[PDB]
Swiss-Prot record, chain A:
Subunit-level organization: Component of the chaperonin-containing T-complex (TRiC), a hexadecamer composed of two identical back-to-back stacked rings enclosing a protein folding chamber. Each ring is made up of eight different subunits: TCP1/CCT1, CCT2, CCT3, CCT4, CCT5, CCT6A/CCT6, CCT7, CCT8. Interacts with PACRG. Interacts with DNAAF4. Interacts with DLEC1.
Disulfide bonds: none
Localization per record: Cytoplasm; Melanosome; Cytoplasm, Cytoskeleton, Microtubule organizing center, Centrosome; Cytoplasm, Cytoskeleton, Cilium basal body
TM regions (residue ranges): none
Residues involved in ADP binding: 48
Protein purpose: Component of the chaperonin-containing T-complex (TRiC), a molecular chaperone complex that assists the folding of actin, tubulin and other proteins upon ATP hydrolysis. The TRiC complex mediates the folding of WRAP53/TCAB1, thereby regulating telomere maintenance. As part of the TRiC complex may play a role in the assembly of BBSome, a complex involved in ciliogenesis regulating transports vesicles to the cilia.
Superkingdom as given in the UniProt entry: Eukaryota
Name recorded for this polypeptide: T-complex protein 1 subunit delta
Similarity comment: family membership: Belongs to the TCP-1 chaperonin family.
Parent-protein residues present: 466 to 542 of 542
Native source organism of the sequence: Bos taurus (Bovine)
Curated annotation (Swiss-Prot), chain D:
Binding site for Mg(2+): 87
Signal sequence bounds: none
Function recorded in the entry: Component of the chaperonin-containing T-complex (TRiC), a molecular chaperone complex that assists the folding of actin, tubulin and other proteins upon ATP hydrolysis. The TRiC complex mediates the folding of WRAP53/TCAB1, thereby regulating telomere maintenance. As part of the TRiC complex may play a role in the assembly of BBSome, a complex involved in ciliogenesis regulating transports vesicles to the cilia.
Subunit organization: Component of the chaperonin-containing T-complex (TRiC), a hexadecamer composed of two identical back-to-back stacked rings enclosing a protein folding chamber. Each ring is made up of eight different subunits: TCP1/CCT1, CCT2, CCT3, CCT4, CCT5, CCT6A/CCT6, CCT7, CCT8. Interacts with PACRG. Interacts with DNAAF4. Interacts with DLEC1.
Positions of post-translational Omega-N-methylarginine modification: 2
Annotated source species: Bos taurus
Family designation: Belongs to the TCP-1 chaperonin family.
Residues modified to N6-acetyllysine: 4
Span covered, complete protein: 21 to 228 of 542
Modified positions (Phosphoserine) in chain numbering: 19, 166, 179
Encoding gene, per UniProt annotation: CCT4
Chain sites annotated for binding ADP: 36, 88-91, 154-156
Residues reported in the UniProt entry to bind ATP: 36, 88-89, 156
Name this polypeptide is given: T-complex protein 1 subunit delta
Source organism, top-level taxon: Eukaryota
Swiss-Prot record, chain E:
Subcellular location: Cytoplasm, Cytosol; Cytoplasm, Cytoskeleton, Microtubule organizing center, Centrosome
Job description of the protein: Component of the chaperonin-containing T-complex (TRiC), a molecular chaperone complex that assists the folding of actin, tubulin and other proteins upon ATP hydrolysis. The TRiC complex mediates the folding of WRAP53/TCAB1, thereby regulating telomere maintenance. As part of the TRiC complex may play a role in the assembly of BBSome, a complex involved in ciliogenesis regulating transports vesicles to the cilia.
Coiled coil: none
Parent sequence residues shown: 2 to 93 of 556
Binding residues for ATP: 36, 88-90
UniProt organism field: Bos taurus (Bovine)
Residues recorded as bearing Phosphoserine in the entry: 5
Binding sites annotated in the UniProt record for Mg(2+): 87
Quaternary context: Component of the chaperonin-containing T-complex (TRiC), a hexadecamer composed of two identical back-to-back stacked rings enclosing a protein folding chamber. Each ring is made up of eight different subunits: TCP1/CCT1, CCT2, CCT3, CCT4, CCT5, CCT6A/CCT6, CCT7, CCT8. Interacts with PACRG. Interacts with GBA1. Interacts with DLEC1.
Protein name: T-complex protein 1 subunit alpha
UniProt-annotated binding residues for ADP: 36, 88-91
Family recorded in the similarity comment: Belongs to the TCP-1 chaperonin family.
UniProtKB/Swiss-Prot annotation, chain F:
N6-acetyllysine PTM sites in chain numbering: 5, 140, 167
Protein localization: Cytoplasm
Gene behind this protein: CCT2
Residues holding ATP: 36, 88-90
Protein known as: T-complex protein 1 subunit beta
Taxonomic source organism: Bos taurus (Bovine)
């Protein structure tokens, strides 16, 4: 959403547009913020190492859980 | 032999202190287990049993003492109650489920957070050191008395 | 106009009178909550940070930050109550304030303060006189002596071994009973062992070696023992003893009223108002116990006329019971002293109608 | 009455959870505007005055004075994400603010915080699975190495000499492969000649 | 949170991008009247009291006490435009 | 016209008890989130930038600057509990809190504190003496020893490998058993690797 | 078990108020009566009732204190069901 | 929901939301019954996809159970019309973005 957003394309519309083409096309089916529409990212020369991804989900997810547990924040003064 | 140097290794120095702190205590309680081969039952089962016993006592005992002993028992049912909350399970449904299944399943009916239901502690593998609960009933209880006795917090200036 | 520099308050008549009645009656109701076996301890926390949890009043009024002049006096009654007989340090404080709660009313009748002293003093004497009548005169009677030492060591951090401490206190006093003197019986605690290892170093001199766990636990055993050495010394110096629990206060309170009738003039209302105050003590007992002070009192009074003034209030059985039989006795000098300090003290209050408050 | 120390904060379950979500989400939507090849820079002029116009989320959060704890958590994600991968440092934060956004709804509904924390974790296990399950498995091979070094040097100023910086980045690592440790790859920026003269000293 | 304590700038949303426009506007219109053979000179008198009557937009933006960052951008344009060709500094 | 100075404390009768109980209970309910298995730690931060994420109640009650006297009484309990055994430190604290809450409830129903105590002293002993004749003397039985161990390792960060350490604690003690002398079991905390690498 | 418990429990405790109030309007403490009555009721069977004129629990059949079934039956059946409906309402339009 | 996926466009999120609004009726049942609406739908949606939609929410036994067996049937026109009426009205209001009412 942010991608199409910081590109001028309608976030909500661009997304659902991708969601469908992602089921018809392939996993590579992404959003080319330089064509104004969906396209095969694998052919657009845009790939990132699986690590960055894997980490991303884990890093932020655990945190969300680390502060979601804190039922109190009292530390005198 | 007659010594064992346990070398701990954790991710960060923060998890190292905890891992070492936890071990020290984990070893302390075991010292209690090697000085007493007795084990009660968790899952609030122990307390749930007391909560019922004391109650039966707070009945055939006239005078305001019945009220106190009654509040004492109810105060114990909090162990399992909280154990459910912290788990995500509704305490109300647990307090009743555990309490009734306790007068029918003996001191072997405790709470299972992982299953969100009451089960058997002796068959599940949930056994605690007697020394632990022993203190609790002696430390906490009597302690409340002092703070309860003190009806005046005076001071110089 | 400013006839005096604004640095010395000055109340007028009922202005000061009333200020003292409340004040001295206030600090009084403070100790009443800690009177009896089921006494509610207090937590004194000075400006340093040292928490002081005690029951005795002298130990509470000593840590208590007191600027009020009238309150200072109440601190000298309990203090002097602990330096003489020791036990019942709170009583004098509670009794004193009680004599105020009664005096005030009389003052409302227009009864001049000074005159109020009449009844209070005339009744007090006869009150102490009625004690010499209902007092028990025991005999080197090792039996009665040790029995009293145990009653002064009961309900304290030395009640677990009050039997040994009683023996040590009785021998220490008997060896210097040349006519005894509490100046030839030194004490000395020491960490190590238990409270059962306490011995008596020998004997116009006796060194009491007290052993105990922590340093605090020992301090209470030494404190219970100190009062034990005073009580035993009181009876040995005065073969007079009575029964606590309240029975005594009930007997006097009854006698006073009666005598108040035989005596006309305003001194009548005073004496009566004096006796009624002799009930605040027994009433307080049933209070700090858990029973209704009103129901108990009257229950004890009816049973006090049917079984002589030997029956009091059993704060452990919840109801009337004979103190004598229950082995609940106290030295005579104690009660004879209690009434004095408290009363005499009070006499000063009424005699003060000014005050020059500092800051 | 007087159970808490003079001047002290005591947020309760329902009270605390709210603040945290807010602080975070607020910080997220802050750098969520610099993400992408068209991101927007943010002039970070601290107290002294030394401005720090950066587009990277990490650099932004590391230059920003952060008073509330909960939002500092995000600053930790950016730092970690920038040391565990480098790029996508702005993503970890944004997503974090989102995960918190949707869960709140559940909270204000009647779902115990714990259950949620357990669920999300379960989805994480599934997420990582699928993603990795469809990732194109590459090969040592110096070819694929110059691919992650070339397409990673573009869009920047080094793109002018990425064809040379890539090979060096491949030889710099190919040697430190004792897992690769970035501490064995000493970098030194000197002033002389041009970026086309650069050399990788073994 | 309390990110940037007292004495701290930071404009977001429309509140800023707008401020930038008006920022570039007021500045623009200023030297806007100094272009052409009939240029309307200005008298820049800084703090020290030094009077400087000029016609060049660059010299005006370099002696103009500017506070907003965006407006300073125009002063940079007048700089790049002055060190490359000169005139037309106001046009840019 | 003032017994105490314009800066002396002395709550009396109820006022003090009411204020005391609340002070303790409040603290008891605080650490009441890390009771038994599974909990929610507290990232404590003094005033000198000393962030500390702990699950143990004792550690929490000691890093917090308590000013309420009655509360300090709880820290003592948490301290005493942690000194003798270790775990359950959160139980004893919370329990005391509730007890006091129930107490003040009876006081409002006009019931002398001492009368309540007497009743509490009757049931308390009744509860203990009961656990003794209601428990079961299992066995040096490693099976049960691992159950007690696994139940003490959980509710923490080590819960992920509680099993691995459960065998390390039951083996380190079983070997030095007979006198339970922990002063012999030395621990070496080494930063690096995972918790599953630890050895005995 | 189930919430049904606490309910049935709170129902019984709500039935103890009858004698409780019977002791209050007597000047006799109720807190002590409830305990005295409840405890002495588990020993003296159903023949244990409060005796205001004596300020203590006494035998109901020995004192000739007997009510008519219809009375109590109606009450229990009445209030109960009635209240149920009152608890089924959670939005009423009365007057300002 | 599944048909919302088989058909992209912004109408996709719409259909999804519509479906979510079709879970309220059941969720409400569990609500008014006393059982946790969420935990209930947990067993419902599950026991439903497994044993066909012939299973619903038994507010009497607190949980899931086959409705066809509990004899809890209802004419098709009931539900049928229900969706309609509600849909048509709500739609109208949605088209209402301004109402000038004098007096």
């Amino acid at each position: 959403s942010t991608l199409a957003e910081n590109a001028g394309l309608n976030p909500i519309s661009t997304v659902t547009e991708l969601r469908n083409r992602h089921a018809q096309g392939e996993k590579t089916t992404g959003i080319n913020v330089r064509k104004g529409g969906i396209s095969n990212i694998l052919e657009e020369l845009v790939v990132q190492p699986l690590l960055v991804s894997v980490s991303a989900l884990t890093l932020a997810t655990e945190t969300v859980r680390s502060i979601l547990k804190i039922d109190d924040v009292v530390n005198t003064r | 032999g007659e010594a064992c140097t346990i070398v701990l290794r954790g991710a960060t120095q923060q998890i190292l202190d905890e891992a070492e702190r936890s071990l020290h205590d984990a070893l302390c309680v075991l010292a209690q287990t090697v000085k007493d081969s007795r084990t009660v039952y968790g899952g609030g089962c122990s307390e749930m049993l007391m909560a019922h016993a004391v109650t039966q006592l707070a009945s055939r005992t006239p005078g305001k003492e019945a009220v106190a002993m009654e509040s004492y028992a109810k105060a114990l049912r909090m162990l399992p109650t909280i154990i459910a909350d912290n788990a995500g399970y509704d305490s109300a449904d647990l307090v009743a489920q555990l309490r009734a299944a306790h007068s029918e399943g003996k001191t072997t009916a405790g709470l299972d957070m992982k299953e969100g239901t009451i089960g058997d502690m002796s068959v599940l593998g949930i056994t605690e050191s007697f020394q632990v609960k022993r203190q609790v009933l002696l430390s906490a209880a009597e302690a409340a008395e002092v703070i309860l006795r003190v009806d005046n917090i005076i001071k110089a200036a | 106009i400013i006839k005096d520099q604004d640095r010395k308050s000055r109340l007028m008549g009922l202005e000061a009178l009333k200020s003292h009645i409340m004040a001295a009656k206030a600090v009084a109701n403070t100790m009443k909550t800690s009177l009896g076996p089921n006494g509610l301890d207090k937590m004194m926390v000075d400006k340093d940070g040292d928490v002081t949890v005690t029951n005795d009043g002298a130990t509470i009024l000593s840590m208590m930050d007191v600027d009020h002049q009238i309150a200072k006096l109440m601190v000298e009654l309990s203090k002097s109550q602990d330096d003489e007989i020791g036990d019942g340090t709170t009583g004098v404080v509670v009794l004193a304030g009680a004599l105020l709660e009664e005096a005030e009313q009389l003052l409302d009748r227009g009864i001049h303060p000074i005159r109020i002293a009449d009844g209070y003093e005339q009744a007090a004497r006869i009150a102490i006189e009625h004690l010499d009548k209902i007092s028990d005169s025991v005999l080197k009677n090792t039996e009665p002596l040790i029995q009293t030492a145990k009653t002064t060591l009961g309900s304290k951090v030395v009640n677990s071994c009050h039997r040994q401490m009683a023996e040590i206190a009785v021998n220490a006093v008997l060896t210097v009973a040349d006519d005894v003197d509490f100046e030839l019986i030194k004490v000395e605690g020491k960490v190590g062992g238990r409270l059962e290892d306490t011995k008596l170093i020998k004997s116009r001199a006796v060194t009491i070696f007290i052993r105990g766990g922590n340093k605090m636990i020992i301090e209470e055993a030494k404190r219970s023992l100190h009062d034990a050495l005073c009580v035993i010394r009181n009876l040995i110096r005065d073969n007079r003893v009575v029964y606590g629990g309240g029975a005594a206060e009930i007997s006097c309170a009854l006698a006073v009223s009666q005598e108040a009738d035989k005596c006309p003039t305003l001194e009548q209302y005073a004496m009566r108002a004096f006796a009624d105050a002799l009930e605040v003590i027994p009433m307080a007992l049933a209070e700090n116990s858990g029973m209704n002070p009103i129901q108990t009192m009257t229950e004890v009074r009816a049973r006090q006329v049917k079984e002589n003034p030997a029956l009091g209030i059993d704060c452990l059985h919840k109801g009337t019971n004979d103190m004598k039989h229950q082995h609940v006795i106290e030295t005579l000098i104690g009660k004879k002293q209690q009434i004095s300090l408290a009363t005499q003290m009070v006499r000063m209050i009424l005699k003060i109608d000014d005050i020059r408050k500092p800051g | 009455g007087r159970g808490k120390s003079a001047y002290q904060d005591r947020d309760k379950p329902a009270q605390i959870r709210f603040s945290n979500i807010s602080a975070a989400k607020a910080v997220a939507d802050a750098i969520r505007t610099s993400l992408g090849p068209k991101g927007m820079d943010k002039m970070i002029q601290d107290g002294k005055g030394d401005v720090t116009i950066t587009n990277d989320g990490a650099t932004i959060l590391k230059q920003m004075q952060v008073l509330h704890p909960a939002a500092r958590m995000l600053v930790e994600l950016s730092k970690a994400q920038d040391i565990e991968a480098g790029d996508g440092t702005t993503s970890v934060v944004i997503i974090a603010g989102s995960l918190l956004d949707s869960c709140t709804k559940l909270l204000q509904k009647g779902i115990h915080p714990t259950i949620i924390s357990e669920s999300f974790q379960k989805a994480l296990e599934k997420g990582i699975e699928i993603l990795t399950d469809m990732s194109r498995p590459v090969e040592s091979d110096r070819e694929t190495l110059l691919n992650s070094a070339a397409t990673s040097l573009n869009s920047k100023v080094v793109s002018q000499y990425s064809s040379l910086l890539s090979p060096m980045s491949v030889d710099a690592v190919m040697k430190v492969i004792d897992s690769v440790d970035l501490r064995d790859i000493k970098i030194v920026k000197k002033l002389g000649g041009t970026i086309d003269d650069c050399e990788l000293v073994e | 949170e309390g990110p940037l304590s007292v004495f701290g700038d930071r404009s977001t949303g429309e509140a800023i991008r707008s401020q930038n426009v008006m920022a570039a506007a007021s500045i623009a219109n200023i030297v806007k009247s100094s272009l052409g053979p009939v240029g309307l000179d200005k008298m820049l008198v800084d703090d020290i009291g030094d009077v400087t009557i000029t016609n060049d937009g660059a010299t005006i933006l370099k002696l103009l006490e500017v506070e907003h960052p965006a407006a300073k951008v125009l002063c940079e344009l007048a700089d790049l435009q002055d060190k490359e060709v000169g005139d037309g500094t106001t046009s840019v | 016209v003032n017994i105490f100075k314009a800066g002396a404390d002395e709550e009396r009768a109820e006022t003090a008890r009411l204020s005391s109980f609340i002070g303790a209970i409040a603290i008891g309910d605080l650490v009441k989130s890390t009771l038994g298995p599974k909990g929610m730690d507290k990232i404590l931060l003094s005033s000198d930038a000393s962030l500390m994420v702990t699950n143990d109640g004792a550690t929490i009650l000691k890093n917090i600057g308590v000013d309420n006297p009655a509360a300090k009484v709880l820290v003592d309990m948490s301290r005493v509990q942690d000194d003798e055994v270790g775990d359950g430190t959160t139980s004893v604290t919370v329990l005391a809190a509730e007890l006091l809450r129930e107490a003040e409830s009876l006081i409002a129903k006009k019931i002398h504190p001492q009368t309540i105590i007497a009743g509490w002293r009757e049931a308390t002993k009744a509860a203990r003496q009961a656990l003794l004749n209601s428990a079961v003397d299992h066995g040096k039985f490693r099976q049960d020893l691992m159950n007690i161990a696994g139940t003490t390792l959980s509710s923490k960060l080590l819960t992920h490998h509680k099993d691995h350490f459960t065998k390390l604690a039951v083996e380190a003690v079983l070997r030095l058993k007979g006198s339970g002398n922990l002063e012999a079991i030395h621990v070496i905390k080494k930063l690096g690797g995972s918790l599953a690498d630890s050895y005995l």
